[PDB]
Each structure stands twice: as C-alpha cells, then as structure tokens.
Amino acid sequence: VANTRIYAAEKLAKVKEKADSPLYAPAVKTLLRDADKALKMTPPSVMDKTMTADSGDKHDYMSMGPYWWPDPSKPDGLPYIRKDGQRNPELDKLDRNKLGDMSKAVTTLGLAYYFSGDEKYAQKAVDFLNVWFLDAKTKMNPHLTYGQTIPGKNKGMGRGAGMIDIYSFTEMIDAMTLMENSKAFTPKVKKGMKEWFTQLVEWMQTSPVAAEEQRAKNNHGLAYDVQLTAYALYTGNQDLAMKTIQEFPEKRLFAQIEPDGKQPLELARTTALGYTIFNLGHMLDMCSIASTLGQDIYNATSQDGRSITAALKFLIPYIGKPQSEWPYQQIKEWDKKQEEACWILRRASFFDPKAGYEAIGAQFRETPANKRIHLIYSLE
C-alpha cells in the first residue's frame, strides 16, 4: 500500500491487483494509451512563454487571471475587465497551460507506471519533472509572486488567486509517491522535488501574495489550506499539516457552509453549480488527506449544523433534475457538472457509506467504463 494522501491508498492497491479484471481492464487500457500519448509530448517549461514577469526572470511562473479580458471601451483594452466564468484564450500565451500539461502528464505517467510496472513511463515522468523543476536552464522558481497577473491591474504583480493554478500538484505528489520504486525516480530526484516543495511552503507561509490567498473567504482560501497540508506532508512537516487540519473546520467549513448547506460565495457565481462542486471536491480532498493522519474532517459539525454533509444535502436534489430547476446561474458545462456531481457522491460514500450516496450517483451517472475515475475512486 503506497503512502498516498489524496488517493485512497488501500483501494488503489486493490485496483492494481485487479487491473486485468473485467471491472478495471478497460480503464487500465485507456490509462496506458494516455501514457503512450504522454511519451510523445516534449516536456514544456516556464521558458516557453514569450513574455517575462516584471521580475525580469523568465524562470518566474507567470499566468493571467483567466476571467479578465480587454475592455473594448478603452483605447488599448486597458485595464482588463472581468467576465466571470468566461476564460480569455490569451491566458495560453503564459505558463498556466504548460504547467497543466506537465502536471497531467506526470500524473498519467506515474499512474501508468504503478499499474503496469513499465519503467519507460517513470523515465518519461522524471524527464518532465527535471525539465519543469530541477534543470537549471529551464526550471520554475518555487513561488507564485506573478501568478494571475492582470493587464493594467495590480501594478504588474500577481495575486493570491494564482495559488489555485498549482492545485493539481496535490495529486501529482501522489503520482510521484507511486513511482518512487521506479529506477528513474532516484533518491536525487526525490530530494530535488522535496527541496522545491520545501521552498514553496516557505514562500506560502511568508509571502504577502500567498497571504492574500490564505485570507480568501471562498474556494480559494479552502484550497490554500489543502495545498499547504499536502505540501507540508510531502516535505516531512507533519506538524504543520496537523495544525492546518485541526484549524480547517472552523476556518473554512463553518465559515463557507451555511446551516442549510448553501455555500453562498460559490452560489453567487456565473458557474454556481461548478464552484459548489469545485469546493466540495476540495473539501473531500482534505477529508482524504486528514483520514491518513486519523483526523475526522468529514464529520466535523458546527453547533448550528454546518458540515460537509449539509453541503452535500443541498446539492443532491439537483442531481438528475433539469437546469430549469436550479435557481442559480450555470452558464456552461451543465452536463459535465451533473456528471461530476455523481462522482462527488462516490467519493462522499467512502466517508458515510450508510447515507446511500453511491446509489444516487449510480442512478444518474453515464460515465463510460474506461474512464480513469473508475480506477481512482473505486468501490474496493
């Protein structure tokens, strides 16, 4: 059983034993196909962008606030203006999509190595990690001072919101763990990766840009805690992880969930169903991490009934009901988010099996048998 924090380690180990069973074989085959596609990809880096942040160092990560667009009423489009839920394709010019491609590839490859034992996949993953994190010529500095810059705003600086850009590192770390016994993922590679994340954690605890994210009242602030906890554990700082976990119900859950389960700061968005689910999934990621340390975040309940269960119970009636009945905005991705909701229910069922959540999810889910999520959130 591997030391995973986001992924349920014992379940995953059983799915691996049963990789060739009829239940898992289609998904394993698709996973190895995805890994074969990743073998073809040239590892990107923060050096690929044409622009450089206002530090003048190309090795600094730079991205753009995704919902910020040129203002047609202004001569040069500046300053940009916000269109909540509408992603400006200009963001592709900077580092965000390269980081995404890298993180997804390493995750795919590490999972492929875990399930198959084929060393080629771990060797490619280590190539991505060298290029992105460790090689002097191409590496990303371990900070997000210039995360989610916005043209014409914030005096060229990034902002706390940029922290969300790296949220997938929570999962990537589990994929690295899963590859540690590969030949390619050496003690030197491991040390380099732990040193990078140690520096990132130092920056997260000191920087004023990171502090902006820590103070955030919505999904950003909840996600900050999850990332801090996961990176603390990866770097051996169990005490910081424990502290962040113990403070999480009062700081995040009871602040952001109303007694009827509503998450008002998410429901006010143009993608209110999407953000309700985004935050619930991050809550469940914290529950998963916390469970590995014997901390029961899932059942944490305030005196007035705020809890993850309340938040789930708000959502459930809308699953399988048409958009007409959802009294908030959801400007895109309705069917996609309905499907995601069904997998929220699978994940919740791990913590509260008697609630009948999987039966509800199974009633409305149309997820093909070969999708990776069947492997990661199995019923083992």
Ligand code: NA
């Ligand atoms: Na190794």
